[PDB]
């Protein structure tokens, strides 16, 4: 009965739209959906820009001190996810009220809906521990009044994210021919990191790990299983370079991404070396470019890579520091026309943050896809679920389960490997005109002690996944965050000064404080974090 209709398709495929166009637009320079910003805290990288004082709080972020509850950027950053939350809220109100007869994909869009929900949640899980679950778009304003970030308990808090993920999987298309609309495989993905994450149990008071569970392993193994990742085509791109490239959008391994397009992804806007005149933020550090030497026989360099910097005509070397980092006497983005170097054309604050610019989020200058309104910014998607992740992840599982599958794990681990001692694609070149000594080996398929193969599990994410802003969140699932980041601190000091003051304090610095602002409008609904 057409009169009698609350929403038309029209209307309601609107709103579906609305709520995937805020992860394009509802972020900033400074709050970033990548999180790049926050990233600022882990061994990868510094934050740069032209002093200390070029965002001070981001600054305090990096060395772990002087972070205050109630920072604007950490404010900021909770309402800006929690405003993704209503808008994918807002889409399901209405399509809940639909019926199928009228809109046939109901249930596919609500999953679609119930998943962007789910990816918001992640974040601000990472972020902040004690969440507020927004997972009742019916929700009348005195129960919204009412929520808390204690209703739940840690582990419930991430099975109501993983509940979203589940119901993604179980609605979703195997094959979407609009690109940045979810699939069955990207659900099941990030449904197998929702129980990594929650695997690696903080069931006490405070941060430190409690236990790592076998049943949420298990999960991960379950949907991580190549079978469901083969019925949407998911795998690893022929070269490592065709994540971070304009023109190899949306490929096997771009499990889910955001789409921008010339919408460009301003929130990366200060991550631009100063060649292009601002603003030389996200600054990969000497002890990332130490990470990526190898040995003789093309292995990580374990207990001794970071003794002394890596030297292009003496070391051995994994191809993906070219693509990750942009070093003094390279191309930057591959472009022969700007070859970086120590100078004021390549950073913003006389070399204190260094002259190494981040590739990944770049691209060549002369790109069309490149413009510039305050900052410049590009249309590269932002890939938030790779396949070498899915690899990784499935490994990391087995790995930690420990019941007879290391071995596999490690053939896993050597897919994701292999995969980088053949990229030279856009680099090959290298050695006749730099003297670059690429040698990258899989591992020997042989028994491992778990802490061994757990130790090549973590390598191989360090060099897998530099820059891309989840080395921190790792350390903390981890629950070695002090220790790695204080020994960072302590060897990082004598290259980038910023970091002679620093320290981390465990039980305090796992987890950004929940904001003041956001703890006194609750009237008490809310707790803060453990050390704040
Ligand atoms: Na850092
Ligand atoms: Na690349
Ligand atoms: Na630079």
């Known amino acids: 009965v057409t009169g009698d209709q609350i929403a038309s398709p029209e209307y309601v495929d609107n709103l579906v739209i609305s709520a995937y166009a805020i992860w394009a637009t509802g972020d900033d320079i400074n709050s970033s959906f990548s999180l790049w910003n926050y990233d600022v805290r882990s061994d990868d990288c510094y934050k740069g820009g032209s002093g200390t004082e070029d965002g001070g709080v981001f600054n305090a972020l990096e060395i772990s001190k002087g972070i205050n509850t109630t920072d604007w950027n950490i404010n900021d950053i909770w309402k800006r996810l929690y405003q993704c939350i209503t808008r994918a809220n807002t889409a399901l109100q209405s399509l809940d009220q639909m019926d199928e007869k009228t809109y046939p994909l109901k249930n596919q869009r609500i999953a679609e809906m119930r998943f962007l929900r789910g990816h918001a949640h992640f974040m601000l899980k990472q972020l902040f521990k004690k969440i507020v679950i927004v997972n009742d778009e019916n929700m009348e304003p005195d129960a919204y009044n009412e929520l808390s970030n204690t209703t739940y308990t840690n582990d419930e808090q991430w099975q109501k994210i993983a509940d979203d993920f589940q119901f993604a999987y179980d609605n979703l298309p195997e094959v979407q021919i609009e690109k940045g609309r979810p699939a069955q495989a990207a659900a099941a993905a990030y449904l197998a990191k929702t129980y990594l994450y929650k695997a690696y149990r903080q069931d006490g008071a405070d941060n430190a790990l409690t236990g790592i569970n076998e049943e949420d392993l298990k999960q991960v193994v379950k949907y991580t299983d190549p079978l469901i990742m083969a019925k949407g085509g998911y795998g690893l791109e022929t070269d490592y370079s065709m994540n971070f490239l304009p023109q190899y959008e949306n490929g096997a391994e771009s499990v889910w991404a955001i789409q921008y397009s010339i919408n460009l992804n301003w929130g990366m806007g200060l991550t631009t070396p100063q060649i292009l005149g601002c603003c030389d933020f996200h600054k990969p550090s000497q002890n990332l470019v130490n990470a990526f030497k190898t040995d003789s026989q093309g292995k990580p ?139 990258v080996t899989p591992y020997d398929l042989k028994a491992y002690a778990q802490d061994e193969a757990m130790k090549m599990l973590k390598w191989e994410r360090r060099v897998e996944f530099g820059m891309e802003s989840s080395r921190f969140f790792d350390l903390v699932r981890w629950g070695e965050a002090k220790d790695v980041i204080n020994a960072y601190y302590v060897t990082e000091a004598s290259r980038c000064s910023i970091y002679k003051n620093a320290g981390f304090t465990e039980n305090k610095n796992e987890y950004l404080p929940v904001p003041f602002e956001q703890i006194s409008a609750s009237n008490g609904n809310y707790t803060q974090n453990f050390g704040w």
């Not at 910097?309 to 390279?330: I, K, Q, S, W």
């Not at 022969?336 to 060549?364: A, F, H, M, P, T």
């Not at 490690?410 to 730099?434: C, H, P, Q």
Request: glycine residues 6%; proline residues 3%.
């Open 301 to 439: 360099l374990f207990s001794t890579y970071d003794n002394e910097n890596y030297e292009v005509a003496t070391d051995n070397v994994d191809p993906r520091l070219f693509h990750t980092v942009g070093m003094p006497g390279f191309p930057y983005k591959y472009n022969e026309g700007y070859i970086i170097q120590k100078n004021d054309d390549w950073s913003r604050s006389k070399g204190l943050y260094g002259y190494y610019v981040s590739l990944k989020e770049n691209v060549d200058p002369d790109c069309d896809c490149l413009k510039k309104g305050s900052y410049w910014a590009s249309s590269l998607n932002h890939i938030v679920i790779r396949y070498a992740d899915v690899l990784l992840m499935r490994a990391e599982a087995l790995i930690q389960l420990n019941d007879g599958r290391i071995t596999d794990a490690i053939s896993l681990i050597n897919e994701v490997r292999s995969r980088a001692a053949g990229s030279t694609m856009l680099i090959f070149n290298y050695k006749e005109d730099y003297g670059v000594n690429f040698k």
